[PDB]
């Protein structure tokens, strides 16, 4: 039960001694990791993290890599963190509609960094598998009533003013450019013009409209012949 150190899929368990509770009858926090492969330019040299602890941030991974290099004495320096929808709020871009659950991605600087922290976490897996008491202690930046009144706090009026003004300026620039691009006589390569109207301002919206979208039976002699037939 202490030798469950590597899954068949290839995931390394990283247990953690948590700070104990004053009224508790130490404890274990099961963290998982595996390196990620992708042809994306901004998704090179990245580690897939599964079951992150509560509200773990840039500071959390900084303290963790500090403890890791202090223990195993490797050179590994993390760069950023991706896919931190730990709650599930930033899932859908409603803005882009109008105009990796429970996981995270950790960025490193180079292949030396990723391979050094990789063998560090491998030695950590063997560390739990042979002697599960010499592990790290995961700590939270534990919130108190100061962070709670930050969660119940009024907003900064100057920050609000600056954000509103800059967003309005960039939105006006983009809107004016798109309007001119629509009503700037879009002539195709083979002589074809395009039919826009007065008061339209989005060629995207034109494509979106496209994506959204007298039998006189008694006239002739044969027909009146069949009419005579239907009288018979």
């Amino acid at each position: 039960i202490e030798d469950i150190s590597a899954m068949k899929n290839g995931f390394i368990v990283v247990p953690f001694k948590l700070p104990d509770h004053k009224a508790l009858p130490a404890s274990l926090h099961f963290m998982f990791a595996k390196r990620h492969q992708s042809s994306n330019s901004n998704e090179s040299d990245c580690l897939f993290l599964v079951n992150l602890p509560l509200l773990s941030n840039i500071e959390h991974m900084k303290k963790f890599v500090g403890q890791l290099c202090g223990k195993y004495d490797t050179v590994s320096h993390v760069e950023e963190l991706l896919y931190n929808d730990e709650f599930g709020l930033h899932e859908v871009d409603l803005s882009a509609l109008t105009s990796p659950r429970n996981t995270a991605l950790l960025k490193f600087v180079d292949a030396a960094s990723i391979n050094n922290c990789w063998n560090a976490l491998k030695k950590y897996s063997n560390l739990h598998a042979k002697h599960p008491n010499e592990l790290f202690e995961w700590t939270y930046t534990t919130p108190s009533f100061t962070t709670f009144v930050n969660f119940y706090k009024p907003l900064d009026i100057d920050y609000l003013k600056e954000d509103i003004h800059t967003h309005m300026a960039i939105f006006e620039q983009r809107e004016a450019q798109a309007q001119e691009d629509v009503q700037s006589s879009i002539v195709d390569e083979d002589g074809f013009t395009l039919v826009v109207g007065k008061n339209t301002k989005s060629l995207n919206s034109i494509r979106k409209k496209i994506l959204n979208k007298k039998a006189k039976k008694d006239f002739y002699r044969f027909q009146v012949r069949e009419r005579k037939k239907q009288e018979i």
Partner: protein, 1081 residues
């Protein structure tokens, strides 16, 4: 259509209620053996009083001599018994014997001889004393014959009363486990009566005296004359049963309706309820078959079905008065005629037999029958819903707190029959005995008249139940002997029940007549009725009238005060008055920390109207500010604006979660809105910024800041304007424009097929917050003004849900709808006239609700815009489409709909099936508690204790500061602080904490809390629990994945289960400075 549905439904009820020929043959064989027995009973002659005294002294049977006993110094006649004329009376005799759960009865008349009659036996108890010694001799000889033929092994014989008539005792024989009819559950009654036309009707009239010491005794005249004319009724009903074909189904329908309402054919003038059952229904429908027109037209025809007969007779009892305006006249052996003179008593009169039928019914019984007739006539003329089970399958008479709106327990330590003159304030003399033969009758009529004249218009109807009335006594007793109730009389105490007019439920003064030079008779009865409490006050306009002023109190009503005064004045000095149930209910409602809150009534709205006044001042200011887009509308949409806030709004009380009432601020139409949702919210933020700048630059006394709204998912820039107006109130302005519905529909269109239901939930949250909320608010405010008691009922129901920890996951508008259901549709009950009756009606309805089959359709209106046939059927088709898409209800449980919202999902969306089943289970446990145990302070205390069980863990937390005063409840914060950070400091986080942990462990855990810490944080208002349930999804152990969305622990290299302790330590580190206790299972 109505014909088809009602015919199939009455066919179902008749095949349900139909009895069996095996039971019929068993009981007729048994009564045939009783026939042989009574023909073997031998006759006997004139004997004397001391002779029959020695007879029944040496014998075990005791004669039931009624009060007063016959005395040989004053009786100059003697006794005899010859062959009685035997007949069988009952529904079986009318060929309508039906199954009854507790049992039924077939009576048998043993008719007394004319040759035994003397022509002056009707005078002065003579014929009834003859009847008593008659029945006693018959009991003795039937006892000999049963000891002879060995039927004594399982037959039990007792004395009883014919429909609770204390002057007319009968016999009652019953069988326990070949002539045994125990499977039939019958009990046969033996009646001693008189033949037809055996005394003078013109001397037997209700105004003709038969007791001399001049006042008459009409009920005694009725008893002797009905016991004479029992069989003429039987042959007349046999004639009408030959004449019409549907009589038996009509009378079983009437009988089941009467027993479902709670009436009976028993005596009601002894402080009981009833007087109208099977026999009265049959005689009445026979008279209505004979006719009933104003010029003797026929109202009911022979070819009518039972539906038509029932509709006709209930139309007659609803429309026509028979007590105070007119009377009905018919002949049994030529036509019936209504005449226009009320006799202040129920008056259906037969001149062929010279009888009044409903003299067992008192005035209050007739009043309640009139109201029930009106209610069922309304439900018959209702064409929209199915009212059938609504009328016939809901016995409301179980709980008196659900049948009547105010119950009153009064104890009467009387003493003795000669101690009456000291223990009463009234007088029970000779002519009082003549008019009101039994002490129970006299005291009951005294309480009815006293309480009715005392209350006046504060009650619609009244009822006096005599708790402890045993209508059964053995053969060895002279009458019903008891020692309960502080005296030797047949009651424990008096239950005074009131059907109350809610508008005049709390009028402070009790207005009387004016003042002339001469003391009028009415003002004289007023002065001798009130004594010290009366006065003569000059009002504001200048009238000079008598009135007895009271004082309002929160904990107890003026009805309680006035009935206390009236009973302790004009009844006795020893009675005890109580309604601690409603006393404790008014105590359980919160009391705001305000001046004069204790003496303030429960219907006061002055705090709400002060809030509205401050809002209107701010409304004028922001309306006359100057903006680039002029303001089009400002709509208050808050819970205080619809009177359903839990804590009443106190000035400067800034810790109640309903401190900031929502207002919608909508500008004029403009074509220059942005067309990108984030920049649109930012433009609305720009408008609010300009508004705030102008306010802080012009009207500096107001204070203001800016907050966020994260209740709408994926729309993260919604900024709201918090405004603190210096009368101590807060409003968060949010802006609604003409582009929001368009952009949300466009987003849900352009989203792909997986994420479409997520944006469905998003748009539905948006609608329920912004658009239908305004309609909801104005509708509920209007109908609350028409229904005052809706606001205390919804406040008590929200308190109940908060203490049972369901409010965090059930929205307040759904709470208000499920609270207002009984006020809108109280069928078949009454409109609630007490906080107690309303809340318990809500609990009974939510317990009996089967939401898997039954949707909730409401028509939020003033009493008699309603949802017509097409809209009703369309909403039901929406419901059945939802149930075909979801038969089990894993996604939706409550389908509630009204005129402002025919969708059916809009308010009950996103509700956990554990929470819904827990709510229904709590209601069922509550109603079973009230079924097994009587309603009292311990039961309601157990109702309000939180559960804390069935939860897999509980987390007990406390705040560093008690919040009762800051929430505004006395057992006060004067001014706003100079720092909004200190406002956030005195604020409370626990709801945001439990919401964020719900959002975190939404895949695996259900975490609930208490919302209102100011009432539910103990005596200081500083405690909050966090209960947590594990899903079966992670109670099972599963394969390792990548989007499992839980903190886990593997059981091997492939399969994993959840990490309970790690969750617990995460919550502990989150609430490190706040969590105190933690219990696990």
């Amino acid at each position: 259509f109505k014909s088809n549905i009602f015919k199939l439904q009455i066919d179902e009820l008749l095949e349900q209620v139909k009895l069996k020929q095996k039971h019929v043959l068993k009981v007729e064989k048994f009564l045939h053996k009783l026939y042989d027995i009574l023909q073997e009973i031998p006759d006997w002659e004139e004997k004397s009083l001391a002779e029959v005294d020695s007879f029944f002294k040496n014998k075990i049977v005791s004669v039931p001599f009624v009060d007063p006993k016959p005395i040989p110094q004053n009786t100059n006649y003697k006794f005899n018994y010859k062959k009685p004329d035997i007949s069988l009376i009952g529904s079986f005799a009318l060929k309508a014997g039906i199954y009854q759960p507790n049992g039924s009865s077939i009576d048998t008349l043993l008719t007394m001889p004319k040759e035994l009659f003397e022509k002056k036996d009707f005078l002065n108890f003579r014929c009834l004393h003859k009847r008593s010694v008659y029945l006693a001799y018959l009991t003795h000889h039937l006892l000999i014959l049963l000891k002879k033929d060995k039927l004594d092994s399982f037959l039990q014989l007792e004395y009883s009363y014919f429909d609770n008539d204390p002057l007319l005792p009968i016999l009652r024989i019953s069988c326990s486990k070949d002539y045994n009819f125990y499977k039939t559950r019958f009990s046969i009654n033996l009646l001693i009566g008189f033949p037809y036309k055996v005394f003078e009707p013109k001397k037997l009239l209700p105004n003709r005296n038969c007791i001399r010491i001049l006042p008459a005794t009409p009920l005694y005249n009725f008893s002797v004359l009905s016991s004479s004319t029992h069989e003429n009724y039987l042959k007349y009903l046999y004639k009408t049963k030959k004449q019409t074909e549907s009589f038996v189904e009509a009378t079983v329908l009437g009988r089941l309706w009467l027993q479902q309402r709670g009436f009976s054919s028993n005596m009601s003038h002894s402080g009981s309820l009833g007087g109208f059952g099977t026999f009265e229904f049959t005689i009445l429908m026979a008279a209505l078959l004979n006719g009933g027109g104003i010029n003797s037209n026929k109202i009911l025809l022979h070819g009518f079905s039972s539906y038509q007969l029932f509709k006709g007779v209930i139309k007659y009892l609803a429309t026509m008065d028979l007590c105070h305006d007119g009377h009905l006249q018919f002949h049994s052996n030529p036509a019936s005629k209504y005449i226009d003179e009320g006799f202040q008593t129920p008056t259906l009169f037969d001149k062929s037999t010279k009888v009044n039928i409903l003299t067992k019914m008192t005035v209050s019984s007739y009043q309640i029958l009139k109201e029930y007739a009106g209610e069922t006539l309304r439900m018959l003329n209702n064409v929209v819903q199915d009212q059938f089970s609504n009328i016939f399958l809901t016995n409301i008479s179980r709980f008196d707190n659900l049948k009547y709106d105010l119950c009153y327990d009064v104890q009467l330590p009387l003493g003795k029959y000669n101690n009456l003159e000291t223990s009463l304030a009234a007088t029970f003399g000779s002519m009082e005995r003549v008019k009101f033969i039994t002490l129970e009758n006299f005291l009951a009529h005294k309480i009815t008249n006293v309480a009715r004249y005392a209350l006046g218009d504060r009650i619609k109807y009244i009822q006096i139940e005599m708790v402890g009335q045993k209508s059964d006594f053995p053969i060895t007793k002279r009458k019903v002997y008891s020692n309960t109730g502080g005296n030797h009389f047949n009651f424990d105490f008096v239950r005074v029940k009131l059907i109350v007019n809610p508008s005049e439920c709390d009028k402070l003064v009790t207005k009387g007549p004016a003042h002339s030079e001469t003391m009028s008779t009415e003002a004289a009865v007023f002065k001798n009725f009130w004594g010290i409490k009366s006065s003569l006050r000059r009002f504001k306009d200048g009238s000079i009238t008598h009135c007895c002023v009271w004082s309002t109190s929160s904990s107890e009503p003026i009805i309680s005060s006035i009935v206390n005064f009236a009973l302790q004045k004009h009844v006795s000095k020893k009675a005890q008055i109580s309604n601690e149930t409603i006393k404790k209910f008014h105590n359980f409602l919160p009391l705001p920390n305000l001046p004069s809150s204790a003496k303030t009534s429960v219907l006061n709205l002055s705090s709400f109207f002060n809030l509205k006044k401050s809002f209107d001042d701010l409304y004028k200011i922001i309306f006359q500010m100057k903006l680039p887009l002029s303001v089009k509308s400002i709509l208050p949409v808050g819970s205080a604006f619809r009177y359903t806030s839990l804590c009443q709004p106190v000035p400067f009380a800034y810790s109640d979660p309903d401190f900031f009432q929502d207002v919608i601020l909508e500008f004029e139409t403009s074509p220059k809105w942005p067309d990108e949702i984030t920049s649109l919210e930012k433009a609305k933020t720009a408008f609010l910024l300009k508004i705030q700048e102008e306010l802080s630059a012009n009207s500096s006394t107001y204070r203001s800041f800016f907050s966020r709204d994260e209740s709408i998912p994926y729309n993260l820039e919604i900024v709201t304007l918090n405004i603190l107006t210096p009368e101590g109130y807060g409003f968060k302005f949010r802006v609604l424009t003409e582009r929001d519905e368009i952009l949300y529909l466009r987003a849900i269109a352009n989203a792909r097929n997986e994420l479409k239901p997520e944006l469905e939930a998003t748009f539905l949250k948006f609608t329920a917050k912004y658009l239908a909320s305004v309609r909801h608010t104005r509708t509920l405010e209007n109908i609350s003004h028409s229904y005052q008691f809706y606001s205390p009922v919804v406040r008590l129901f929200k308190r109940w849900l908060d203490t049972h920890l369901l409010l965090g996951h059930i929205t307040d508008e759904l709470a208000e709808l499920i609270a207002i259901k009984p006020f809108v549709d109280p069928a078949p009950y009454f409109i609630p006239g007490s906080l107690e009756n309303g809340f318990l009606k809500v609990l009974k309805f939510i317990s009996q609700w089967n939401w898997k089959d039954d949707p909730l359709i409401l028509d939020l209106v003033k009493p008699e815009e309603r949802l017509t046939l097409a809209q009703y059927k369309g909403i039901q088709m929406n419901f059945t489409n939802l149930r075909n898409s979801d038969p089990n209800g894993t996604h939706l449980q409550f389908f509630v709909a009204s005129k402002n919202d025919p969708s059916g999902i809009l308010y009950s969306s996103g509700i956990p099936l554990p929470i819904a089943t827990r709510l229904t289970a709590l209601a069922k446990v509550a109603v079973n508690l009230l079924q097994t145990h009587g309603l009292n302070q311990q039961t309601i205390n157990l109702l309000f204790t939180p559960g804390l069980k069935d939860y897999d863990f509980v987390v007990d937390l406390r705040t560093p500061i008690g919040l009762k005063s800051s929430c505004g409840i006395l057992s006060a914060p004067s001014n706003f602080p100079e720092n909004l950070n200190d406002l956030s400091e005195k604020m409370d986080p626990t709801y945001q904490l439990v919401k964020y942990l719900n959002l975190k462990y939404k895949n695996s855990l259900i975490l609930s809390s208490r919302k209102y810490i100011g009432v539910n944080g103990g005596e200081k208002g500083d405690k909050n629990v966090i209960t947590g349930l594990i899903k079966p999804l992670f109670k099972g152990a599963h394969k390792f994945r990548v989007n499992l969305d839980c903190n886990v622990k593997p059981v091997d290299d492939e399969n994993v289960i959840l990490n309970k302790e790690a969750i617990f330590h995460e919550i502990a580190a989150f609430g490190n400075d706040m969590v105190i206790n933690f219990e696990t299972d």
